[PDB]
Design an enzyme around this catalytic site. Structure first.
Site, short mmCIF file in Angstrom:
data_model
loop_
_atom_site.label_atom_id
_atom_site.label_comp_id
_atom_site.label_asym_id
_atom_site.label_seq_id
_atom_site.Cartn_x
_atom_site.Cartn_y
_atom_site.Cartn_z
N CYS A 1 0.79 -1.23 0.00
CA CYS A 1 0.00 0.00 0.00
C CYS A 1 0.83 1.29 0.00
O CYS A 1 1.36 1.71 1.03
CB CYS A 1 -0.92 -0.03 1.22
SG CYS A 1 -2.01 1.40 1.43
N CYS B 1 -0.49 4.10 2.25
CA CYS B 1 -0.28 3.76 3.66
C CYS B 1 1.13 4.18 4.11
O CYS B 1 1.33 4.59 5.26
CB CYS B 1 -0.44 2.25 3.90
SG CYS B 1 -2.06 1.53 3.46
#
Length: 103
Positions: free
Chosen positions: A28, A31
């Site tokens: 991700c 993230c």
């Protein structure tokens, strides 16, 4: 600073007070972009709230339990119950705002 949490000890660590749980994954990109923002936020709230991280690939059941479909997803807990949720990237300001709303 930020403590990791897993399917095994989740209920143990999320039961009293206010916790912010970060549902992330290594693949991700967004993230990784919010990670530094949470480390600062964590400092801003030592003694007020706990910020935890939960890798969704290694802990699928907790992710499924709270309907986490897209990440990043941040969920605010208060005494073991989810009371708020934030999706996508968010600057420190907006996150601090969501926390003070539950403290």
């Amino acid at each position: 600073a930020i403590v990791k949490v897993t399917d095994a000890d989740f209920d143990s660590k999320v039961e009293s007070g206010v916790q912010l749980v970060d549902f992330w994954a290594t693949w991700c990109g967004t993230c990784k972009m919010i990670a530094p923002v949470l480390e600062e936020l964590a400092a801003d709230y030592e003694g007020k709230a706990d910020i935890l991280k939960l890798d969704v690939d290694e802990n699928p059941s907790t992710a499924a339990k709270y309907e986490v479909m897209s990440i990043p997803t941040l969920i605010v807990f208060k005494d073991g119950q989810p009371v708020d949720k934030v999706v996508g990237f968010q600057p420190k300001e907006n996150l601090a705002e969501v926390l003070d709303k539950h403290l």
